[PDB]
Amino acid sequence: SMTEYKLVVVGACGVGKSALTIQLIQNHFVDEYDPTIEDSYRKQVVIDGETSLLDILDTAGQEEYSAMRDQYMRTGEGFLLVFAINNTKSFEDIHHYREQIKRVKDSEDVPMVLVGNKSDLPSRTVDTKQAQDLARSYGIPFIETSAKTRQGVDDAFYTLVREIRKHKE
Ligand SMILES: *CCC(=O)N1CC(NC(=O)c2c(Cl)nc(CNc3n[nH]c4cc(Cl)c(C(C)(C)C)cc34)n2C)C1
Ligand SMILES: Nc1nc2c(ncn2[C@@H]2O[C@H](COP(=O)(O)OP(=O)(O)O)[C@@H](O)[C@H]2O)c(=O)[nH]1
Ligand SMILES: [Mg+2]
């Protein structure tokens, strides 16, 4: 029976969580996807020759950290930490999201990938060397993406599936 991986896309408002997920699922760039809508999506993929089913949660909509919600997020097997390269606050919010995840999972090894989205933009305020360095300190992979041009979208998600597989090993 084909393996199921539950992936959670996290990051500040407007970083591109919805546009990344819609590119992976529908291969189309949405620029007006309702910001409050928190939906999940299923996609059958072949990664390194093994077929699997991804269940992908695109987080949305401001809410306080509750206990019920903690238990819902505990079911995530892997987390995409998304910042935008032209949003210093989005980059700064990464540590906060990683700790919340370390907390609910009650564990130091959680499968995670750092994603710097909007790499198509010319106005970059977060240097590639800064994000590499952070990812090295977490010991997680770092991918630069553009949901707009589709550069790196599949690779960010499939890098996370590979982190989950190694974890399960
Ligand atoms: C347009 C607005 C938008 O896209 N965003 C993203 C940001 N929202 C959040 O950061 C957010 C959401 Cl969504 N829910 C919550 C708090 N709820 C919650 N309770 N327990 C947990 C546990 C975890 Cl691990 C999370 C993660 C997965 C880290 C988001 C969330 C909760 N927050 C802060 C506004
Ligand atoms: N230029 C560029 N714009 C993007 C990219 N990704 C998303 N956007 C735009 O940024 C805004 C927020 O995207 P969205 O996916 O809704 O962000 P979310 O709140 O994290 O879901 C929208 O206008 C998108 O069209 C990208 O990779 N490059
Ligand atoms: Mg969204």
Numbering used by the authors: 0 to 168
What are the paper's exact sentences on this?
KRAS is a G-protein that functions as a molecular switch regulating cellular proliferation in growth factor signaling pathways. Mutations in KRAS impair the cycling of KRAS between its GTP-bound active state and GDP-bound inactive state, leading to dysregulated cellular growth and oncogenesis. The switch-II pocket is a shallow pocket between the effector protein-engaging switch-II loop of KRAS (residues A59–Y64), the α2-helix (S65–T74), and the α3-helix (N86–K104). Upon ligand binding, this pocket undergoes significant conformational rearrangement [e.g., increasing in size from 150 to 280 Å3 in the case of sotorasib (3)].
We describe the construction of a cross-docking database comprising 100 examples generated from 10 structurally diverse KRASG12C inhibitors with known X-ray crystal structures (3 of which are newly solved for this data set) and describe a method of incorporating receptor flexibility into CovDock to produce a docking protocol we refer to as FlexCovDock. To further benchmark the performance of FlexCovDock, we collected ten co-crystal structures of structurally diverse ligands demonstrating conformationally diverse switch-II pocket poses. We then docked each ligand into every receptor structure, leading to a set of 100 docking simulations (10 self-docking and 90 cross-docking).
